[PDB]
């Protein structure tokens, strides 16, 4: 419309997908299927 | 206090100004 | 032949609780809920409003709803407050926001099956059931929106008994609520089809009675609905005492409904008369008529000046000759015959009660049939479309669910009762 | 600034307590108390 | 036989409203049970 | 019944300390929480319950947090006279302030105390049955109430969902000006208020300054004035939840009248019997007197005229010995005048209130005491024009690119002024658009 | 005609000492087991539930058996425990563990030889002996496998005599143990082919009751098994009193039962109403039967307006007239002709009691036969098949030594059970 | 009724302290071991028994034994304030330690102590009627905790067979630490706590530094504030065998709904009322609110955050002034809650206990009294997180065989460190797979 639908300023009203972000990080089942580098360890 | 009929009626609006509620 | 009322809302708790002081005190009943009258005549008719307790005490067959106990609390703790039955209480835990849709649609549909489940409840419990009698504002929330739905259900139930509803209507001059007009005419679409007699009150006519008629220095919603309570209280006496020529709701509405359609009516009560002139002029049935015919007396914005009579019905109360009354009905309708509609032979309607109203010789109650109300549907129908031409305050309707399309039909089903009204004014014998 | 402003009043009701003034507010009764005491107690409902 | 089923009424309700279960209190209490509760707790007193 | 007060920054604590101080005399707590139990003469009511929670050993705390990012202010309310009346955890303080940029206190700073905050919203929110808004109080001229306020806002409305925010907010004032940046800040808080709010209340400190410099006797007037009459203002409008009253209005009753469409939700606000004690002795102050007044454009606490516009919806609280009949005849006589104009499409104009409660009186206040008193706050196109004021500076400094370095350095986009600036156009033009009259009707 | 009371788990022995409250006040019997009362009409069937010791001393004929001895010294805190013959109360030392295959065959074979032993003892002394009463609760682990067990072996040696269980089942709203849905299934597998007739009972309900009906600011454990011990003490009345139209648990049972596996039923007590309200209704049979039919008195959470009635049984209590009794059971039969099964002409039972319990002039007990009761064990089902297909905790029951075709073979006995529910809900004459 | 405690090393004994101190002081028995003479309550009640036997000449003394290598921690309780409490027997020491060797207690040292150990545990069991567990408490990171907890938990796995064995114990911090081999010590111990514990609660010192920081006031806590935490704890989950109740809840009946698989038996810990003095005049502290303080992180303690994983199973202990409605009313208004989850195999999630003893008060102590309090155990997926870390700094640490010559030297085949790295690499793939959606029936 004649507005901006808030993805600018870089916010979303959209709710997060509860089941998908309640899995747990594993070293086999999510580091290791990265394409940059990643680890457990604290920065 | 008159009714509309002209009977005598009661208060029906409670007295506040100049009241204090601790004695 | 006993009535069930159902009071909705601020304005008919308000008025209920007035209404249920005057019947109770008519009948000697203590606010304790203890009889304590002086006459049989009292006791052998107290089935039609009140349920009998044990040990002498009577309960009022009422049910009082609302969306915020807040109001349920004041009528709970009002003088008489505590005669009412704790069970018969129905409220939510949200209000109904102004707003017709939620009242119709969200906290309505919520709360709805508990007051048909008492509304039923109450109405199996009759020998024989008479009319209900519903009090609510059209200008209102929960009012307007719970009230339409509960009358349509109990049409859906009871489809053969009275529906009767006394209802309040904004006043011309200045309003209580900026989205009056959506409220009103939904309400008025709802009623036309689902009900058999409405009444209708403007605040500002009972202000102009008091300032006018009675003088009164410092007026208060306690008069108005006093007032108001007087009426109510009388259209029924002839049902609960004896009396010359007997009346009731079903034939009082054979006598005032020409066609199903035009169940709108105007009311006024005459004896008002300020505590000063009071000592310089006795009652008689002419000081009524009078009194009871002048536009200074009816209780609406429309004058019957600009209209004409199709029906009316007078209802006395007291000790008193069938003459005064023929002749007098007669003579009003002889000397002002341009006002009545000429394809009827005879317009009003009388019956004679024995028992007046306590401290008064006599009385009389006028429930009147104009087409004057045309004036009122058609403001309610122009501001409507001013607003609605605008999308003026749409969104939150549309935002509990409402389909437009609602608007445009209650609109036009107003518009053609408004038209009907003006063909009816215009007929003639030909 | 806040001190002789707020502070002094304070004190002042602190040693005076017939400021507080009356008032009536009757529409808090027993139906508000037991919506109160029954959060969370919803049981028997259809869907 | 009207004015006695009025006094066998007034006798009920009178029997009811004076009773321990709406009330919520117990008066028939044994001596081990002034110190196990298992059941009939309901909540401390004002002393306590 | 209940509500929740989220103060943030310096004149949202501040304002804060004279409410606080106004509740609680109205109920009648005492400063360290306490109340004089057995000195009563009528009988113990839970009108409290909308501001405060009981502990069960009778005493009482405040339904309230205060944010600040430097702790000297809400150090100050910790160490005052009230100390024993808030739970400490309620009075949050970071370490450094948002030195007046907007991106200092949304970007870098605001985002590490922002969790604390709403973690003792949800604390609060869950001791809670019918709760049926929040009130936000902040000044949009300073760093972290922009940038906070805007980031707490924005989680809210994901949070809450549907919940209402009602905020009233200290706008820049058009002449008297305290901070160079005060635009920027301003017309970046614009998304936060005009999508994320459901009605907002603009103030500005020169028209209360000419308030009590012209109704009251005060020469040399501060803060604390100010704010006990924006404290009064507030009383007046939640008493309707917290009295008896004719007619009562509950706060959805105010977004139902006041707003026709989603973004036109910013109103003005006036109040009556500002007048102080020796005059108010030698005057009746009758039911439309005070109407009257309330229309004068001397009464109001925003600084514009609004018979440069039309008005959409006014809501009149009514609060006192007032009686319905004298209040409609006043309604009626004020639409009789030819200076107050109503755009076509909303004819029938008005809301009315009417509560039993006088008006409390504070014992170092400066009002006098009166028995009635009307408050007022009513939609109208007039406020286009406060915005175009803030829009001509902005042009004039962005242009130059004045002090751009601060907001880009420290994490901003350039695109966001255009951005901002060319959503708050849009905005006046729907204010345009909304207000012109239908005449072509066939 | 003597019954023998067996009280199982924490809940049966709980419900139980209210039960005998109950029963030892309406007989005056002192908690030290004296008589004190006034009347041969409490002496001339005291035998029915006591027995006599010598000396004046009477003894209650129940059985008290649990796992861990916590409830037996919970009952000996009681007002009444004293009353308990010592050689009645069986325990061990070590508990369910809530385990179902644990209560059932690892303590349950160790203990229930002693049990059937005590129960045959207070069996053989009776002179002719009438149907067995049981308490337990379905979702424990002793009360169920032990219950059931006991159950199974009573069945064995009194085939031709009547098994009666009062039963609690996991409410799907609240639980306190999260390995309900298990033991649940099995015991119903159980109760199915061994139980001549059952009542079920929520806990959800009887909060229900509490709250809205009788508005107790702090209800406990006490009150809901005051409610439970009021209806199981009022359906044995007619055996124990004089009446005009006598009735027995075996004429319940014909009268109930169309098929023999459609033996579960709905419960109901009528006289229920808070202290605040009771000043505002007198005592009236049409009160009595319209609280009786009112779903919000039954003592589940499936609501009958979902199902329809094959049979129902009223048994009223006090001196009142069979007429009022007869036309207000035609009224409720006529009115709702929808909701009770065509295929059988009358589906009402009435019985009459001339004694009422004391300190009530009236009282009516409900017990009712609607397909409804389906819905509950259609969700304990969903809840078995969402643990099932996982295999979620089943090491304890397999490490007890259960084959995991047992948990199929259940399931299918209850899915059975529903579809044959079903399919006479949707039975047509043709 | 009764139930064994087996103290190992340092934090072990440091630990028995606090807990013997508190179930003295909770019972009533005087330091040295004999109840007060004139203190006639009138009821000689048998709760003690659970903790306490009597010797016969009417000295109460505790079901413990306290295990060391070195002598100075015990010979400081053999020489303090409690001397005569304890039987000289139960203190056990040697002469030196396993100097952070996991292979040095497990092969060399702890097999010369094991068999006084598993003497005494014959003397106490035989002192018993109906024993229902043994409670152990050690620390993973050090040498003798480590590698004699695990010999002497094999031992007791091997005679008394089906006796349940539940552990408490200290794992390493992901960040602070105190020793260099810790990551050795931890995954050789693990393969230990897999195959010979029913249930193990998992402690980090880390966290209850930061709850003793947020919500007790203490700037500079030590170890005895922790101690008496977990000396709460502990009595809190032994309190339902101990005091009359609505719903009491034996030791099998916490296995028995906590467990869902056999190996699935780690889980977290949490309590809830942790307030100082002056917190707990400004606030209540009903059942809903410390019911809903359970499930905060903020109040976890064992540094993991349950939002990244699924609740299986949950257990309540209430203690103190409660009634069933009001914790059914908690629960069902955590079910409510989208960031709880719970895995749809588990539909019936909680398990309840309500006791009516409340927590006891100690003098010194730095908690506040209170009229109830809840403790919760749960297991939850979220676990696989802290495995993990342990998992990457073994690695890098074995990679370069940075310290194996020490291990070899004392008695261990190189090859033990890849085993154990590969069983902890399949305990970490068990919760990544329990927590896969069922989605086999699409
Ligand atoms: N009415 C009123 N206005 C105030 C008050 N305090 C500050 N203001 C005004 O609000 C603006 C300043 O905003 P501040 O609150 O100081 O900004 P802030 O929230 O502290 O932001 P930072 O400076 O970054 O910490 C100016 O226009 C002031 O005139 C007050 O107590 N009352
Ligand atoms: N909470 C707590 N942690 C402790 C305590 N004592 C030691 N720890 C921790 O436990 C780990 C050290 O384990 P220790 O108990 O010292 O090892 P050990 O049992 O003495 O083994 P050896 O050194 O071979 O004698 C470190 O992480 C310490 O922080 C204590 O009293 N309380
Ligand atoms: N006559 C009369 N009118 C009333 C009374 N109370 C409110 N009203 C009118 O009813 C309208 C307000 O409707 P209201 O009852 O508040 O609607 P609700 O919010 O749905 O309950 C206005 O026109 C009021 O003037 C009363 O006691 N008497
Ligand atoms: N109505 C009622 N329910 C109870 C009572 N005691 C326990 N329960 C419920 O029964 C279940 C516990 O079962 P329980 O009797 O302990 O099983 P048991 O261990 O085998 O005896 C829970 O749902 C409790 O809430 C009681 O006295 N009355
Ligand atoms: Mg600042
Ligand atoms: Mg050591
Ligand atoms: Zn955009
Ligand atoms: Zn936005
Ligand atoms: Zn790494």
């Known amino acids: 419309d004649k507005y901006h639908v808030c993805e600018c300023y870089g916010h979303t009203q959209q709710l997060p997908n509860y089941k998908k972000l309640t899995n747990p990080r594993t070293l086999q089942g999510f580091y290791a299927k990265q394409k940059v580098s990643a680890c457990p360890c604290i920065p | 206090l008159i009714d509309p009929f002209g009977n005598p009626k009661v208060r029906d609006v409670p007295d506040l100004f100049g009241r204090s509620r601790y004695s | 032949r006993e009535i069930v009322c159902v009071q909705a809302g601020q304005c008919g708790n308000q008025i209920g609780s007035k209404f249920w002081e005057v019947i109770s005190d008519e009948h000697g009943v203590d606010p304790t809920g203890t009889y304590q009258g002086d006459s049989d005549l009292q006791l052998e008719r107290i089935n039609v409003y009140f349920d009998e307790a044990t040990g002498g005490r009577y309960v009022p067959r009422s ?14 703790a009002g003088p008489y407050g505590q005669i009412f039955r704790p069970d018969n209480f129905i409220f939510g835990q949200s209000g109904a926001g102004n707003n017709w849709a939620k009242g119709h649609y969200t906290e309505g549909a919520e709360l709805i099956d508990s007051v048909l489940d008492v509304c039923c409840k109450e109405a199996e419990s009759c020998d024989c059931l008479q009319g209900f009698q519903i009090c609510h504002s059209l200008g209102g929330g929960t009012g307007s929106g719970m009230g339409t739905l509960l009358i349509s259900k109990l049409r859906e139930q009871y489809p053969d008994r009275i529906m009767m509803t006394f209802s309040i209507i904004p006043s011309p001059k200045v309003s209580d609520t900026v989205v009056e007009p959506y409220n009103t005419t939904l309400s008025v679409h709802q009623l036309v089809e689902n009900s058999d007699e409405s009444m209708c009150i403007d605040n500002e006519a009972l202000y102009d009675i008091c300032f006018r008629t009675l003088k009164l220095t410092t007026p208060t919603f306690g008069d108005l609905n006093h007032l108001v309570s007087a009426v109510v209280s009388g259209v029924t006496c002839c049902l609960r005492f004896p009396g010359q020529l007997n009346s009731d709701l079903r034939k009082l509405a054979v006598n005032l409904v020409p066609f199903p359609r035009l169940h709108f009516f105007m009311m006024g009560f005459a004896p008002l008369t300020s505590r000063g002139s009071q000592q310089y002029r006795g009652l008689s049935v002419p000081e009524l008529t009078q009194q ?10 429309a004058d019957p000046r600009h209209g004409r009579y199709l029906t009316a019905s007078a209802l006395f109360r007291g000790r008193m000759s ?26 009003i309607k009388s019956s004679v009660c024995d028992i007046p109203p306590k401290g008064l010789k006599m009385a009389v109650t006028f429930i009147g049939n104009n087409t004057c109300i045309q004036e009122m549907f058609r403001r309610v129908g122009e501001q409507f479309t001013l607003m609605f031409r605008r999308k003026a305050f749409l969104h939150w309707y549309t935002g509990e669910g409402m389909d437009e399309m609602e608007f445009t039909e209650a609109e036009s089903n107003m518009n053609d009762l408004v038209s009907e009204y003006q063909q009816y004014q215009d007929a003639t014998i030909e | 600034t806040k001190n002789v402003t707020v502070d002094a009043t304070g004190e002042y009701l602190k040693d005076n307590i017939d400021e507080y003034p009356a008032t009536s507010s009757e529409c808090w009764g027993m139906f508000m108390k037991f919506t109160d005491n029954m959060k969370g107690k919803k049981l028997r409902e259809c869907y | 036989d009207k004015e006695e089923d009025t006094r066998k009424a007034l006798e009920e309700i009178r029997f009811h ?13 044994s001596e081990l049970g002034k110190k196990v509760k298992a059941e009939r707790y309901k909540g401390m007193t004002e002393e306590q | 019944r209940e509500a929740i007060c989220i103060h943030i920054g310096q004149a949202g604590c501040q304002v804060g300390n004279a409410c606080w101080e106004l509740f609680c005399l109205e109920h009648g707590i005492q400063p360290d929480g306490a109340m004089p139990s057995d000195k009563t003469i009528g009988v113990e009511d839970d009108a409290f319950n909308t501001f405060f929670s009981e502990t069960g050993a009778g005493k009482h705390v405040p339904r309230a947090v205060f944010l600040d990012l430097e702790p000297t202010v809400v150090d100050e309310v910790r160490t005052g006279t009230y100390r024993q009346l808030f739970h400490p955890e309620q009075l949050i303080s970071g370490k450094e302030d948002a030195a007046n940029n907007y991106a200092r206190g949304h970007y870098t700073i605001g985002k590490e105390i922002v969790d604390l905050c709403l973690d003792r919203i949800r604390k609060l929110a869950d001791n809670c049955t019918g709760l049926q808004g929040f009130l936000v109080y902040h000044a949009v001229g300073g760093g972290t109430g922009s940038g906070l306020g805007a980031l707490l806002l924005e989680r809210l409305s994901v949070d809450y969902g549907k919940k209402s925010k009602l905020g009233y907010t200290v706008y820049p004032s058009p002449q008297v000006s305290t901070a160079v940046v005060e635009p920027y800040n301003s017309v970046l808080s614009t998304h936060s208020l005009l999508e994320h709010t459901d009605v907002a209340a603009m103030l500005d400190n ?15 007037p501060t803060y604390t004035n100010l704010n006990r009459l924006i404290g009064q203002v507030v009383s007046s409008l939640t008493a309707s939840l917290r009295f008896d009253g004719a007619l009562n209005v509950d706060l959805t009753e105010f977004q139902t009248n006041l707003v026709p469409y989603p973004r036109i939700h910013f109103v003005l606000t006036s109040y009556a019997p500002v007048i102080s004690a020796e005059k108010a002795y030698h005057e009746q102050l009758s039911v439309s007197e005070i109407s009257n007044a309330v229309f004068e454009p001397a009464s109001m606490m925003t600084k514009c005229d609004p018979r440069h516009g039309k008005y959409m919806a006014c809501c009149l609280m009514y609060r006192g010995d007032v009686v319905p009949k004298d209040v409609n005849a006043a309604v009626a006589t004020i639409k009789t005048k030819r200076t107050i104009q109503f755009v076509d499409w909303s004819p029938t104009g008005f809301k009315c ?21 009307v408050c007022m706050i009513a939609n109208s196109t007039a406020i286009a024009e406060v915005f175009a004021r803030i829009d001509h500076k902005f042009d004039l400094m962005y242009s130059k690119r004045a002090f751009v370095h601060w907001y880009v350095g420290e994490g901003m986009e350039e695109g966001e002024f255009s951005e901002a600036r060319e959503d708050l156009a849009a905005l006046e033009k729907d204010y345009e658009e909304v207000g012109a009259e239908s005449a072509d009707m066939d």
């Open chain 5, 17 to 29: 409203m004076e009773g321990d279960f709406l009330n919520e209190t117990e008066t028939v209490v």
């Open chain 3, 322 to 347: 069938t003459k005064e009354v023929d002749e007098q009905m007669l003579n009003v309708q002889n000397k002002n015959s341009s006002y009545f509609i000429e394809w009827i032979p005879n317009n």
């Open chain 6, 206 to 220: 020169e028209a209360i300054y000419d308030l009590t410099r012209r109704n009251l006797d005060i020469e040399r």
């Open chain 3, 292 to 301: 009871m015919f002048d536009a200074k007396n009816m209780m609406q914005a």
């Open chain 3, 63 to 76: 049910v009082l709803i609302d969306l915020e106990p807040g109001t349920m609390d004041s009528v709970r």
């Open chain 6, 353 to 373: 209130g009417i509560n039993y409660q006088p008006p409390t009186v504070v014992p170092g206040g400066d009002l006098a005491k009166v028995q009635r008193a």
